[PDB]
Symmetry: D2
Subunit: 492 residues, 4 copies
């Protein structure tokens, strides 16, 4: 797929004509290309979103929802095409690609269903002949910045609420996964999104990234990705005071109390660690097992991890890392751990793979013992199929080790003690706590976190409302002379 | 008077022993001092807030509300002392000082009434034996940065909801107005706020402001003031991803359609321009009057403006600017307007007063004709008793002119046409529209705005909810083996 | 059309074998029949609803909504048939049949869209290790009782939110309009609503009505119709304490201030009086026109009323009344009005065997024309000269549902929003109500309301779970620690 | 204490002059009179309420809240007077009386705090130049009918939210406890409630009951009491369609799974059965204990019940039944039980001797279908049964016409979360006692009543939502059934 830009109702090339090649993480083969958009291209996209705003707002949420549901229908009817794009660009195992596309469909539906239901308020004024009307209206122009790890799902998650609520949009996907975004945009276009309401820009984040986020006409930035990019966005958005929705991943503690159902905890850990090869904002990143069951738990964890097949999406349990850079950084992480004295219980390198897969970015499930609570393995995001384990003995210690993190997104807890479950619901200072089940998050949840997770959140009533600004209209209908306490009446 | 620090439940001096002078805006003479907190004083204060956090959270909102109500009653009983401090520090007219204290009392009541009413949610899970519990919990440590213009109102606005919701607090007030903040803090102390829950740090923002805002342990910053300081706080808080509540002032258009009630519009404009000498986040900053009535309107407005007395708070209608630098900045603005061809219809200089007032920072009501929509007088916040006026002749034009601003907080409209009122409610892209009435904003309102106004808002259910974080707990209580679509069940079979 | 009963997943006859005729109000002749259900059949319907509850509940709102959405799609695909049923059973003008079916489709969509958004709550407990969880759950078994006037719209109105929220349902439509209701149930069944969840019972309300509403397993009654039947239901429903949702119509004041846009007020009034021949819960029932414009207003209104065509659904602007009794009742109202010295400006008589009545305009505040619901193409008009007088005449009524105000004065508009004590106030526009609105009223209007977040929430019950997770000994003020 | 009527801002006697005596449940002696109001007095009270309405509504919630907070303050200053009235009228033990007075204070506080926070809504209209405004407004005239069992608490519970929300009120307390209601009424008047806003009427249910609930000008009826009275109220309020808030008591199952903490379950059971002599809308009325611990549990339950002291409010653990009719009704309950094959494990009769006291009574081996397990007791009598499965426990619990409170003791988190749906009761107390909190929505299933009280949702039962649809296009309207060419 050679992708193009979509600006002011047309598919076009970059004004510079420059492009960037895309490689399969499965095989290493070059498989596509995208347009490297210029700054003038960004301006034209943002101005098109400005010019389309008032007519799009004025349509009302019901007419907007019809277009969004038509998009969903077109996506569902042609879903195989999107599943194949994900498998090609990301190397996801087939069931992960199908689930992701199921999630695009579920999310678009969920958000469109908010039509005419996100009410404003009427409150008492300062007299019987005054009222305060509180309208909820759109922010205006939304810049959507999507990551590579859930390249279809994150696009649906941001576009759907933004459009429903009456914002116009400029979308820029990750440079590793332009194809899934393009395909979704084209579906909204086919469904009848009007000229300029939805724009699509690809390019080097290092050439246009700051420029998009600091532009004077941008009202809201919705973004998922790395901590360092998020920090940079918040710095640059000081220029326009844009509203920020930022999700920057985490370092989820996976906590197994002594009374855990072992099979359910292990099932959930295979999912939390190895789903999408650990390239998940909610991946298990630190494992804490009660000392009474640590040895059995770890023996089983290692035995199951060894049975995971890596390779082609048609048949594998786990896919590859996204690019050569992720593979290099994962190798460095493993070597730093070994250099600090950690002990590798399984994995710690690339697999030995046959045919075309020998050239993809595969990395083995990797399980570490003997790493300190204070170590990089336990304090810095890995985003790869690597995890360290440690023993725990008390509930208070469990909460502290968990909360001892600059991150604050997801967490997992396995236990049958009700007092721990109800107490952890406040003491575990993470945005999502999964008790005796796996993620992922549901659309009806508010996906957010504490500390370095980011700003605001997504999903639920509160998530979609993040795309609406509340404004106040103070009316006096007494029809009588005003009396103002500090304005002498003696003047009138 | 001399202010001190309140750190971990003690009144203390700065650890360097250094202090900074406070000037009277009425006389221009030194009238007090405050401690210059160090980086190490800030650390102890934030550390005390961290250590008090769990036990303050764990009291619950009802018990926290009882302490906050007590503070309210103590403030009320001794209100006169606060009224005096505001008149002394700010030079506010007596009725403005009393109104501000009224507001402190109303706000603290209103926020405390939210006790056990800010509910979380329970939502359907992905099977019948799954639920998603959404709890609302404090962020943790709140840093509150208050401005000089409503130096008692702004403290109440930030401390009441932060505390009610279970956050611990480090307050740093404006260097122009330490006294009113200290006095409020002391009332909270006397009402029984536990040690560490509330800390009070004074010192120049240029010196410790960056340090406070970027600190690894800060979870939320609530701030009101200038646009530049807001932009800086946002840049620095990129280090900790603090939740930001920032209110950065505005450039409120004042719109008077041809069918307006003249008396009401004029009364409201006197209020909107001259209340607090125009040093208000919602001040009338641009005047748009329909061409049919512009000449009568401007004549009446000039005539009323001349009648306002300046000087002592005991009897003035309008007070001084806060400091020498605000006075200089106001003169520059007027001069840049005059050098640009603008017609001064009234004022445009300091008055001539005798006695101590001669050294105070007074400036006359100043009314300007024929500056462009695109001039600095129409595009840059003034925050002083100065306004330009321009004609209008269509509703569409009125909306476009109003929205032609990097600002977006308050706005004012006088008209009897219902179609303009309901339509402007959407087409005027400002956080507050006052229709046939003055401000100020009410506690039940959500004080906020568009564009450069800032982040989030204050007041209403939604304002107090800015100090709570929503967190989810996904529970599976089927008691049955899990089935996960991407995990093969043959890995768990014999 | 011959209709049957749908009980626990089967289309069946009445166990007595008896049936009841349905007449056309266009031609006056018999055009269909429906089953007269017995007590036995009621009990089987309700027991099947009870038997289906837990599995319906446990499916969750998303899976229930998928079925409801498929229902909407099948209805939409076959909409011509339902439009034809309404024109055949009610005689509605073609444009009104098409409207009603648009609103069936709109309503089912809107209610289905509430899936997984009607949250419960979590509040603080009385200590730090105590919480109070507030779940919203179905009431259980819902009895739905529908009127003849919007015989398809009213079915969609009640089935959609009841089903989305996880209640099971026994529906009994009006004996004037069984066909439209059956056709909708059939579509829900075709969509895959499981056995027992939805049941359909026909039978004269005068014969099995009290038995249904009094039944010991019924947890919620949702009904629209006449005031007398609503009152009766609320008496009978004291047996089970069913939660009631009753919409009983009204006596809408239509107020035209001196500054009104005359054209918009006249266009609107033509809609409000003569839409569905006045057989509407929000019909204009009393006309108040400022003395300054009263004459011109009435002259023009009469001129426009006389231009309405009556007869066949294909050609007419206004259909017949529903049946012979309503024709007789409308005559009785007009005759009584004349016997009280009412001045007829136009009409006041029938215009072959159908139940057509002419638009009728009368030219006294306390008379039966002004204090009793007419539900026919008849209205009286009265002069007003102040705002306060206007509010008090409006509010001088045992009814409290809809109302209409034409004015350009913002002070009247904002003030009337509190002073006009009616559930609905239409300012410078016609009805009907929107689904995002909460259709309700004051005084004799009924109980609860329909539409909006609040309306759909009427079908959900709030329950509390108080949990203590201290894991410590309890200390109870009035229980002595020394006992332990 | 002799009480009077408060009608249109004046204290007055019945227009007939007739009065009714009130008896101590501690001694059986006459201790007060109250006025027997006529149908004409009631019309005067309601007309007063009607005449006071617009001025009360137009004050707004903040100003109303101030009057309500002042009433709370005057109540808290003089709280001993109320505590004593509750001990004299009801005979509660001193700490129950103190408890009830704290709850009066807490509830008045809680409801008044809802000032300017119960917002309406703005929703999108059918075009960009339409909106629908949804105002929350008072119903108007509220008739409050309070029971005798919590005779101060229930008055606070009804008056505070009805008044905060801007309704005017006619209060009619139970003929068994007029004193506490009158005292509270006087404090609201002292605090500044204006003329006609709050009226107070006493008299016989058999003279004025129907008449008060069916009156044409009544908008809302809020009532707590017996199933029978609620049913009658619902019949009679068909004449006016009054919005109803009825709480009609219960038959709370109390369920102890095998893994329960025994001490805490027993403590809570002591509270749930004996608090206010079991004359509680949330009282333990049926006991189900896991077969593994049934014997030890019933054993300790009898040993502990034997020790509860009956008698004088200063020193007793449990006071008397409210009047002689409740006394004879309780005996007839315990006798019907023994005549049907039930075993008395403790108590069964009366234990100052002229008063209406009745001992803790624990009945064994009675059928789940028996009068004891199916009909409200409202007295310190309780029947027990074994259980052995979770599904059984739910089915036994839900096998009742009632649906208010229920109690559960267990450490298995799957029963706790599953019971939260499967126990079809408005209130489920898990490893703790009642009573309900002001933030909870006190309500139930089946014959419990209508609507509910407490929480945001409860105060909102006193507001009616109205809609205003506005078109501000300024342009010609187009209506699908009407011709443009006609103009
Ligand atoms: O028996 P119980 O005393 O335990 O409880 P209850 O009869 O339910 O008493 C609760 C309240 O309802 C009143 N009431 C009695 N008959 C009534 C009627 N026909 N209409 C309206 N209210 C009526 C009672 O007044 P009374 O105490 O005067 O009967 C009492 O204030």
């Amino acid at each position: 797929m050679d992708t193009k830009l979509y600006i002011d109702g047309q598919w076009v090339n970059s004004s510079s004509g420059k492009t960037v090649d895309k490689y399969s993480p499965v095989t290493g083969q070059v498989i596509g290309r995208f347009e490297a958009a210029t700054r003038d291209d960004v301006d034209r996209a943002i101005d098109a979103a400005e010019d389309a705003f008032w007519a799009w707002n004025d349509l009302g949420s019901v007419e907007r929802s019809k277009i969004i549901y038509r998009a969903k229908e077109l996506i569902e009817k042609n879903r195989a095409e999107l599943e194949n794009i994900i498998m090609e660009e990301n190397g996801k195992p087939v069931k992960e690609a199908k689930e992701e596309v199921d999630g695009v469909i579920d999310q678009i539906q969920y958000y469109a269903e908010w039509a005419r239901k996100l009410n404003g308020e009427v409150v008492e004024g300062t007299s019987s002949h005054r009222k305060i009307f509180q309208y909820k209206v759109p922010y205006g122009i939304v810049v959507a910045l999507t990551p590579w790890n859930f390249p279809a799902g994150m696009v649906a998650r941001k576009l759907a609420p933004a459009l429903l609520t009456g914002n116009t949009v400029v979308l820029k996907p990750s440079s590793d996964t332009p194809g899934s975004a393009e395909w979704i945009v084209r579906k909204f276009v086919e469904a009848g999104v009007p000229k300029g309401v939805l724009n699509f820009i690809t390019g080097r984040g290092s050439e246009i990234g700051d420029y998009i986020v600091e532009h004077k006409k941008v009202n809201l930035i919705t973004m998922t990705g790395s901590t360092a990019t998020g920090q940079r966005i918040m710095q640059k958005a000081s220029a326009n005071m844009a509203k920020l929705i930022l999700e920057l991943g985490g370092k989820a503690p996976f906590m197994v109390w002594k009374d855990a159902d072992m099979d359910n905890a292990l099932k959930t850990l295979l999912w939390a660690k190895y789903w999408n090869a650990g390239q998940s904002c909610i991946a298990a990143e630190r494992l804490y097992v009660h000392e009474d069951i640590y040895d059995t738990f770890m023996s089983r964890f290692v035995e199951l991890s060894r049975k995971l097949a890596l390779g082609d999406p048609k048949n594998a349990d786990m896919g590859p890392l996204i690019n050569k850079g992720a593979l290099q950084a994962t190798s460095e992480i493993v070597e730093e751990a070994k250099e600090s004295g950690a002990k590798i219980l399984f994995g710690g390198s690339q697999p030995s793979l046959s045919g075309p897969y020998r050239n993809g970015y595969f990395f083995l499930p990797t399980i570490i013992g003997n790493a300190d609570q204070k170590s990089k393995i336990f304090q810095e995001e890995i985003f790869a199929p690597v995890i360290g384990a440690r023993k725990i003995s008390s509930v208070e210690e469990m909460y502290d080790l968990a909360n001892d993190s600059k991150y604050g997104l997801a967490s997992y807890l396995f236990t049958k003690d009700p007092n721990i479950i109800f107490e952890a619901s406040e003491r575990i200072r993470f945005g999502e706590l999964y008790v005796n089940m796996p993620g992922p998050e549901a659309s009806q949840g508010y996906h957010t976190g504490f500390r370095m997770t980011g700003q605001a959140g997504e999903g639920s009533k509160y998530g979609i409302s993040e795309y609406l600004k509340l404004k106040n209209i103070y009316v006096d209908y007494s029809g009588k002379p005003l009396h103002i306490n500090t304005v002498r009446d003696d003047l009138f």
